[PDB]
Amino acid sequence: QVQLQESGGGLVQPGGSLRLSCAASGRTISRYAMSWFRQAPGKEREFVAVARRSGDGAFYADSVQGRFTVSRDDAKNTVYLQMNSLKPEDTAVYYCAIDSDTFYSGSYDYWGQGTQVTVS
Amino acid sequence: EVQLVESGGGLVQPGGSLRLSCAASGFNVVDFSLHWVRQAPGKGLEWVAYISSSSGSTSYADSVKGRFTISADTSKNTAYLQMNSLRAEDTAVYYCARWGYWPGEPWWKAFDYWGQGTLVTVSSASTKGPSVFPLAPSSKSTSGGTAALGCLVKDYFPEPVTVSWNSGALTSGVHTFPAVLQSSGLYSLSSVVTVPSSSLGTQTYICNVNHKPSNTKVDKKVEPK
Amino acid sequence: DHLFPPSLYIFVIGVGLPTNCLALWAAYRQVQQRNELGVYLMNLSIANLLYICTLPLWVDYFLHHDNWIHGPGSCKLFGFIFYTNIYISIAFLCCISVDRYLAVAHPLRFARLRRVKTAVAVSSVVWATELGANSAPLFHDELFRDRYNHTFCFEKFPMEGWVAWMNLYRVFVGFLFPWALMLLSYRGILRAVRGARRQLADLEDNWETLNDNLKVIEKADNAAQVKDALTKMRAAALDAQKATDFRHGFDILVGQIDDALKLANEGKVKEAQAAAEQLKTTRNAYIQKYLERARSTLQEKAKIKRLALSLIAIVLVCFAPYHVLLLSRSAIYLGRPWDCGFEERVFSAYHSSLAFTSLNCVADPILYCLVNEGAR
Amino acid sequence: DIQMTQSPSSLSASVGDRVTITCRASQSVSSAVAWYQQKPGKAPKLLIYSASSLYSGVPSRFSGSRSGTDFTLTISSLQPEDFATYYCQQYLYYSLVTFGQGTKVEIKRTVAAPSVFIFPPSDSQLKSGTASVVCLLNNFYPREAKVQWKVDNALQSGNSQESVTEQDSKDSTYSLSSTLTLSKADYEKHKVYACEVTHQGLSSPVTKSFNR
Ligand SMILES: CCc1nn2c(C)cc(C)nc2c1Cc1ccc(-c2nnc(C3CCNCC3)o2)cc1
């Protein structure tokens, strides 16, 4: 049951924002966690932000601290990423993955297709 | 202020017997009711027994009926709890509580005062000393960044063992893990130190351990092979 | 339309005479029986009789004559009484409403407000203030000749003068204030009574729980049922104590429940039943009194609620159209007077409204029956 | 007996946050619920009695409420000393006393992926038997990791124990160990040994392996 889709992409010049939305129809989004990943000029996948169940909270990384915000938005099963400030170093192809285990072990099974964001 | 001191015992054998004593200071046992609360290792709190010296009524929990007996002595102002037919599920820390009577506020305050705690260990083991083994660094892997070493400790019955590195001079990057009660008794512990790779071949590292209830004091080196 | 005034004022000069005197006598029985509404009813009845006694000359002139057959300067002395009647009526209804709301809501503030002399002083101040307010056009006969016609006094279709502001002030202060005051009073009364019902609900439920558990323990085949029911007895007793000398009875009841709990806990059956029988006497000799007291207390607040609502309804039906039309006429004049068609349409409407609002006379006696009865 | 259930088993919060903890009864008790606080190696301390009523001596930030078989504990701000365990108890009658499960409050920070190490058995244990091999996880947040040992591309069950350190005061990170202890015969029987870890901060699971 792979339903992950990404809605975003642009060439935003320094400053500005680019809202990102992961839409899924697996109907189990209300049971486990999301995760955001990015591929940088260095050919390696890096972790951006994670949203767990309701009330469990959201955890960020050292490159998005106070600049990226992840929102559950369980109304339409779409998880949101807001990027307040962008710089040339943030150019990266973005991917969206789901958390399988209910105790947050982190065995990532399903994945996404990816979108490119050529900021600055 | 009033204080409840628990003077009981430790290290009884399976099927043995024990007797705890909850001395009270300040207040009079003829005015209050004395309970018992115990906490298992890394678990929640449970209720044990209850007495009323004035009225004489006594109540017990499900698991401690027929094996435990509680008697409060007015002359000595001390409660008691006799333990018989002890099994290994009773290994815990035992607390002695304090609860008032029904007229007025005293009943609505609940367990306003506790004791300190007494530790009971039901085991069929004996005194033993540890054995220390090295954890050699990997030359092929984990090279170029930071390398880690360690000093293993195994097969000691009494819980307290203390581990230090370089005679207590190196204190950056040392992780010592809690003891684990493996099958057939005894325990196990491990430690690790993290140092830069270039320093591996220049300065040596010695792990110093010692067991108090057995006087072992065994030392081993972790030089690379 | 020469039918509406004759017939309606015939009804007022009729059914008004014998109801008002009976109301006078009844609330006199009330004032001698240490109550505070009777003085206000005295003042109301006096003003009522005065106005109805002013009516017959009016009901005389219109029926056969058409040009004022008494003195041309005599009709001047028959508008002051009408205005005073209407506005003392609204004032006294408002006073009764606010006093009853204060009594039902805050007994502590109602203390020293239940003194009859305080009510008499308030009524005297109201009478003096209304006399001062209505002494405006008696002093200056020129102000009378402002808008009263040369004869058949019906105001003036050329409403020229400070009338456009006099009547605007009348429709604002004189109607809009007491209506809002009594609206707020009714709202407060409703909130208090609803809260009281919500409070009594759980106490009734707690009594039900206690009685059901007593019935269960009356048989008590084994010793597990006794403890199982006594636990719920304890919880219900504590909740009932929280909801509210009766606290002493609840203390005794909880103590005896604990006694039964212990006796059934040692491993017996009959002694718990003996304690259960002992529980009955303190059950039905301590708490039932306060329960009955609360049951009886609720109904008086219900009475007060419907009294306030009736007062609001009366003050709506009696006076709204006339003051609304006066505001409309003043507002029309204050703008462009080239459109006299509004006045052509609202001429008979405004006369009809001002003649209609005379039924305070006939509705005021009927409110006495919603409190202690006897006048009618 | 009357049961009591606590909603959050663990809670990751930072300083200045606001925290709520709920405990639920089972038989519609009266205002007879008390809240305690226990720190590592200490007796519990009373905070609230009779549903919501502050104790004689206690900071005023703690609060409580009752809504009918529903009890809540709140803290306006988490001072650095308010990181401990909390409990709920009902005391309707002397023989009817039950406790909650307990809630632990910790610190929150940025995700860090674990670093994995391995260590082959030493000569002495191979001499005297019961060889031991240790895989280690170093400096990772949060405390959600799984270690599954692998020999000859085959997973294991049993003969494994684990332990985790508390948060280190310097940077609020953890550490974990898993010791695979086997008899000499089956240890020299097989050839390959490998270790596997999983964490939310890693994209693909990482492995460390050694050879005899
Ligand atoms: C001042 C208002 C007023 N005061 N008042 C009093 C104190 C008692 C009673 C019972 N009614 C009244 C009214 C009402 C009221 C109603 C109709 C009129 C009116 N307009 N044209 C007429 C014709 C004109 C031709 N000749 C006959 C009369 O009569 C005036 C007034």
Numbering used by the authors:
A (entry chain K): 1 to 120
B (entry chain H): 4 to 228
C (entry chain R): 16 to 259, 275 to 406
D (entry chain L): 2 to 213
Lines quoted from the article behind this entry:
Among the over 800 known human G protein-coupled receptors (GPCRs), three specific receptors — GPR4, GPR65 (T-cell death-associated gene 8 or TDAG8), and GPR68 (ovarian cancer G protein-coupled receptor 1 or OGR1) — were identified as proton (H+ ion) sensors regulating signaling within acidic microenvironments. GPR4, in particular, is responsive to protons and engages with various G proteins, playing critical roles in angiogenesis, endothelial cell inflammation, and cancer cell metastasis suppression.
NE52-QQ57 was reported to selectively inhibit the activity of GPR4,17 showing an IC50 of 72 nM in our cAMP accumulation assay. The canonical orthosteric pocket in active GPR4 structure is predominantly occupied by several bulky residues, and consequently, NE52-QQ57 binds near the TM2 side in the 7TM core. In the NE52-QQ57-bound GPR4 structure, NE52-QQ57 adopts an L-shaped conformation within the binding pocket, and its bicyclic core forms π–π interactions with W732.60 and F973.32, as well as a polar interaction with Y241.39 and a hydrophobic interaction with L2727.39. Moreover, the piperidine moiety of NE52-QQ57 is oriented towards the extracellular surface, forming hydrophobic interactions with F772.64, F167ECL2, F169ECL2 and H2697.36. Moreover, in the NE52-QQ57-bound inactive GPR4, NE52-QQ57 disrupts the native proton-sensing network by driving the outward rotation of H165ECL2, and pushing H2697.36 out of its original location. In the inactive structure, E1454.53 rotates into the 7TM core, disrupting its interaction with the lipid.
